[PDB]
Amino acid sequence: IKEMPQPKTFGELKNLPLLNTDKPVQALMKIADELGEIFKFEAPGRVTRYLSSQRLIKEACDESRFDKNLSQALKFARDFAGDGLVTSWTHEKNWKKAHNILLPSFSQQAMKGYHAMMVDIAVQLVQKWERLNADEHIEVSEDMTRLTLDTIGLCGFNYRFNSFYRDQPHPFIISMVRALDEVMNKLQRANPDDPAYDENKRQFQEDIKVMNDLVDKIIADRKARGEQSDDLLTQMLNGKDPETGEPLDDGNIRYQIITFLIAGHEATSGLLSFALYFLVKNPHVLQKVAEEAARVLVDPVPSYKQVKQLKYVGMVLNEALRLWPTAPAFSLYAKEDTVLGGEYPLEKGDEVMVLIPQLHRDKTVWGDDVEEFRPERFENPSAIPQHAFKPFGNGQRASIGQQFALHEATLVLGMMLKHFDFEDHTNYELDIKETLTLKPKGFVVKAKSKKIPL
Numbered sequence: 358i359k360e361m362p363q364p365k366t367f368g369e370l371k372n373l374p375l376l377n378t379d380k381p382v383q384a385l386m387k388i389a390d391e392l393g394e395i396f397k398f399e400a401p402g403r404v405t406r407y408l409s410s411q412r413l414i415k416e417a418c419d420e421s422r423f424d425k426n427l428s429q430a431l432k433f434a435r436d437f438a439g440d441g442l443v444t445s446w447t448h449e450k451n452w453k454k455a456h457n458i459l460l461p462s463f464s465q466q467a468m469k470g471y472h473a474m475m476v477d478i479a480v481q482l483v484q485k486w487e488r489l490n491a492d493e494h495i496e497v498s499e500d501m502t503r504l505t506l507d508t509i510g511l512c513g514f515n516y517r518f519n520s521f522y523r524d525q526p527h528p529f530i531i532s533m534v535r536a537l538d539e540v541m542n543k544l545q546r547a548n549p550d551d552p553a554y555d556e557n558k559r560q561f562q563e564d565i566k567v568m569n570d571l572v573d574k575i576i577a578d579r580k581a582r583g584e585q586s587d588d589l590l591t592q593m594l595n596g597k598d599p600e601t602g603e604p605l606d607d608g609n610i611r612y613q614i615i616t617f618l619i620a621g622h623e624a625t626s627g628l629l630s631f632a633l634y635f636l637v638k639n640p641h642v643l644q645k646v647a648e649e650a651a652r653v654l655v656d657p658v659p660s661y662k663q664v665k666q667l668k669y670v671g672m673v674l675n676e677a678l679r680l681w682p683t684a685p686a687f688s689l690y691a692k693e694d695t696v697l698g699g700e701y702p703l704e705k706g707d708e709v710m711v712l713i714p715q716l717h718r719d720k721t722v723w724g725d726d727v728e729e730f731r732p733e734r735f736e737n738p739s740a741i742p743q744h745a746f747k748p749f750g751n752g753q754r755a756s757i758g759q760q761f762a763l764h765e766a767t768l769v770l771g772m773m774l775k776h777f778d779f780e781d782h783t784n785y786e787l788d789i790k791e792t793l794t795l796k797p798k799g800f801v802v803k804a805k806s807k808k809i810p811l
């Protein structure tokens with residue numbers, strides 16, 4: 358019925374140079390603001406459409422019709438993350454395998470086990486902060502990465518990164534980032550396969566080794582342990598497939614460790630920053646949360662029962678996830694020829710790309726008060742129409758990490774607010790940094806301790 362809009366083009370460079378910025382996802386957000394609920398984005402060799410309406414995304418999330426696609430980002434990350442859970446097709450052997458063997462360690466009862474371990478890390482950060490001098494401050498995104506990377510480490514593989522013991526960032530993180538930059542960077546390189554890009558290839562290739570250096574070291578610390586863990590490394594190593602009958606390959610085992618080491622802390626870092634960013638800008642909300650935290654968290658350290666009982670802290674996080682989904686995009690492909698919206702024709706295997714932040718700012722569904730931070734939006738959570746809100750993605754290919762991140766971050770956001778008054782001491786104008794995921798760049802706060810003992 359209708360042709361699909363398309364932003365400015367540059368001859369054979371098609372759209373590519375529109376996203377020649379350090380802030381792509383946000384440029385994509387502007388174009389979606391100019392062009393509307395869907396638009397064609399062509400780059401040499403790839404074409405993909407970006408959806409922003411709950412109308413369209415509604416259909417796209419329908420699995421009978423669309424399956425998960427590897428966006429050009431994931432097809433590049435396959436270089437280090439192989440065919441782990443995140444970067445593999447539903448149709449590959451190791452997905453459904455990996456899926457059944459690992460899903461168990463993510464039930465809200467596996468949570469129960471992970472709690473003490475989360476607390477371990479949560480106290481480490483709380484103490485880091487009680488121990489700062491006046492005139493010292495808190496570099497927020499840096500600290501959250503410390504925490505969330507210590508947790509996926511300690512819980513996932515029983516491995517202390519001892520992130521707090523360090524003021525120079527961790528030898529694994531450094532490389533991880535260059536990697537997750539070379540990825541974010543090959544994208545905007547029209548012919549990504551020739552050199553000049555051989556200096557970069559080698560830089561990439563020298564980071565993969567460094568990661569695998571650590572993956573090798575983690576396999577080795579499990580060996581010299583009086584191994585006991587229920588932890589997901591144990592699961593991977595010894596588990597078998599109900600569906601199939603076999604255990605996972607060793608090369609696949611490596612890929613998943615990297616996958617869980619990256620996905621594990623990356624997304625949940627941002628969401629905390631963003632959460633805490635919003636609390637310092639919306640001090641009414643802050644005092645509401647302050648209140649809940651002190652009322653519920655009565656024992657010196659929180660028990661699992663208590664964290665599930667932080668109902669409003671859950672809403673603030675969802676609302677932070679609403680405005681700034683830290684994993685802001687996912688792709689899907691036309692299983693069959695079809696017509697999205699009764700309006701837009703697509704052919705088999707045509708790629709489309711849910712643009713979460715714009716889906717999360719869709720008036721016909723949320724209200725006209727979209728840019729505003731109001732958690733109360735989450736009270737009757739029946740309210741959200743089907744597929745209005747998707748920080749965690751869709752159907753069978755959604756974040757297996759949902760319960761976990763959310764438990765984690767509830768617990769941590771819980772404790773900070775029990776323990777500290779906060780001051781945006783510089784009047785931080787928001788600066789979103791984009792690796793694959795989003796997070797506040799240079800967010801800094803002071804923290805007046807409320808002298809409550811742990």
Ligand code: HEM
Nearest residue numbers: 442443620621624625684687749750754755756757758762
């Ligand atoms: C609040 C934090 C998190 C956010 C916002 C988030 C977001 C997402 C999104 C959007 C996807 C789907 C991408 C796609 O369809 O291509 C995904 C998948 C995935 N996430 Fe998360 N995630 C979070 C936390 C975690 C955590 C803590 C873990 C580790 C336990 C994790 C592990 C994974 C894995 C393994 C997948 C691939 C699942 C599959 O395809 O079978 N995530 N996540």
